[model samples]
Target: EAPRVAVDPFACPMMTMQRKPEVHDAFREAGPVVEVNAPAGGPAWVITDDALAREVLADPRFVKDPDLAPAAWRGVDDGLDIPVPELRPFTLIAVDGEAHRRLRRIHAPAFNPRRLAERTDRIAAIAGRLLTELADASGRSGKPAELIGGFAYHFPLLVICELLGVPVTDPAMAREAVSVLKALGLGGPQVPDTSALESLLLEAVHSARRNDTPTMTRVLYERAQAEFGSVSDDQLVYMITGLIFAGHDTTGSFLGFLLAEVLAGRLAADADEDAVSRFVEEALRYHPPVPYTLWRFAATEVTIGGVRLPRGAPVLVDIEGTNTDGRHHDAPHAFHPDRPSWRRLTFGDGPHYCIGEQLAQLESRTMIGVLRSRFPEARLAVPYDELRWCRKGAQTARLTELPVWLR
Candidate 1:
């Protein structure tokens, strides 16, 4: 049995003025695998060591089927619902084995380094254009720039639109997409319907079906058909929807962390391209967007970090904790991009590793490069600690607003 730690890492921060580093320290100080109360009201195992996290992630026996979760877990609908309930199984977070491989096969190339490299110029173009407009707006308004609501929130979806070959004729669609996605994460009553974005994605899937254009949707459709003999339009839509939600929420929040560091002067304003890359890694380690991974269940009795978890035990990886683990690095609490190796579970590990890794990195790297070059003297309007965060326990926490003066 893993030792039980009194820490409730999933609980909302004692106060939002700062992150729960005291909590992070507790988990890291606890043994690699420790038991803590789950956010959902039962005992859950949190893997805090990097080595153990990699093992658990790569081991196929620890599966992602929500059904494998403890019987008393909040109703499945509470945690993992979408407009179409039937589509849950198709998410990369929810399946394993041959099923996961099939979906991964369809997704691999779309986000692979080569494909993203081809799109780098376009991505950089978007960053440059948006930064220009953002600086203009802040100039005219006489207020600090609103990045979370403006560039950071919409930039990724705009890119997703480009990826799916869906023309974004209206910023209103992107605005509405933000509200709905935010509601889904907040998990409050009156969760918004996903129809707005779903309709756009559905049409994209239809266009892929028609095969009239060269787009990522077209690539995905062809790959899906090639891999699975045949595929349905909505199935493709579901896949795209899942991708949009995952990529948008995480990357959007992630941008906040990256920008926070940049604005705080943790990264040099004139940092080189390679330094920017290192900054990205350090920011991920320092303030991971997704603090905890999606729940996993033991398909069979499995031992992780010498703790025997019975079949059906629910598990979580404290990625934020693991990345900052004291045992692995000097001054683990400090933000040091050049400190060392690139090993991190922020993008996760093994077969279920994030396919969006390259795309997120590219977007982040480009935005930082653009920001630094465009406004080498950019400063936060309010001190960094004053910013508000929507802390989604057991999920991604994000800045509600990023007030910056790009001068």
Candidate 2:
């Protein structure tokens, strides 16, 4: 029999307010898989072991359909209603099976190593230019500069926008794109009036079609048009919108925490490629951006780690909990870079693994290398412990502010 963990009725709210690790610890200590009342409503299983979590992630019995949620929870106005997959079939997160496979193919090429290598110089140039701007800003203010608000946030957005062929150089276009992306939620609730942003993206798609720029948007539009004969303008627009939201937000959050590690000297100041790569992997393991995988449900009655889950049962894999599980790593809580395990579930595992993992790694490596080289004496302005992190609902383990003195 699976353990039934007793948790506060408002456990999800508490966790959303930056107490997720504590909550995850409680669940992990209970057992590999524990039953609890879901915040969205009804009983849900939370998996906390590394192996079982991967099992749950890869199993075809478990799926990403929110419609499989409890009947009482399904039609309710919880601000969590994912638009129907039929209406948004092109969304990577909302689809499964062949539909997901098709969408992944559309996105895979942009993040492939060869394609990313071609952009390395451009990515590094963006990082260098941003750091120069940061330095200038810090000099003008004569105070510690907050990287999260400026460089950390904009660098990935600009890079992604450039890749998508959206003109971030135009002040109005850039502001609108950022606004639309923000409204899509950085892992929080989706903002209303997203149709306007959708319209803007539609315009971008048309622009890409008319122009000669070789962009991810152009590639996706051409391929999607060729492959799916009846694919609607809305379908193409949502696909691009999903890419913009997913590609930039998580990376920006990861950059913040990674930079914090660097400022704290938890990572070496003069780290080399091998050392930096290890640190990046370790940092991702130590503080995965998303604490939990998005909601997945059992397609039918299924047994997971000895626990029988009924059809429509809601489930989530605890990415942070499992990555830091004692069974997986000795002294899992510590920031030891010399650990034997180079593998991590941070970018996820199995078929749904993040497509932008390499791009994120490339961006982070370049950002860190450039920042350290340019500002050898850079240091955190606030005490390491003083930095605040986003709440669980933000869908990422992100620092809210990272004030640094690039002296």
RMSD (Cα, Å) for all candidates, in order, is 3.0, 3.5
Give the per-residue lDDT digits (tens) of candidate 2, residues 1-407: 57877652223332221224567788888888889877656787888887788878888888877677676664442424355556445667766888778877877765667877788778888888877777788999897788887777678877877777655654234444655654443222433345555566777788767876667777787777766775566676666666666667788888988888888877776677888888888888887887777778899899888888898887878887777777778888788787996556788877789888888898888887877777777889988767767544525556778888887
Error of 2 at 144 (Å): 1.4
lDDT of 1 by residue, 176-243 (tens): 66456544432324423456666777888888888756578888888888987888877787677667
Off by over 4 Å in 1: 14-19, 74-77, 80-89, 170-196, 388-390
Task: Report how far off residue 353 is in candidate 1 (Å).
Answer: 0.4
Taking all chains together, the TM-score of candidate 2 against the true structure is: 0.88
Top candidate on TM-score is 1
Please list the residue runs of candidate 2 whose C-alpha ends up more than 4 Å from where it truly belongs after superposition. Answer: 8-20, 71-81, 170-200, 211-213
- Candidate 2's displacement at residue 103, Å, is 1.2
**Candidate 2: minimum summed lDDT over ten consecutive residues — where?**
9-18
Q: Rate the local accuracy (lDDT) of all candidates.
A: 0.74, 0.73
Against the true structure, candidate 2 has what lDDT? 0.73
Clashing pairs in 1: none
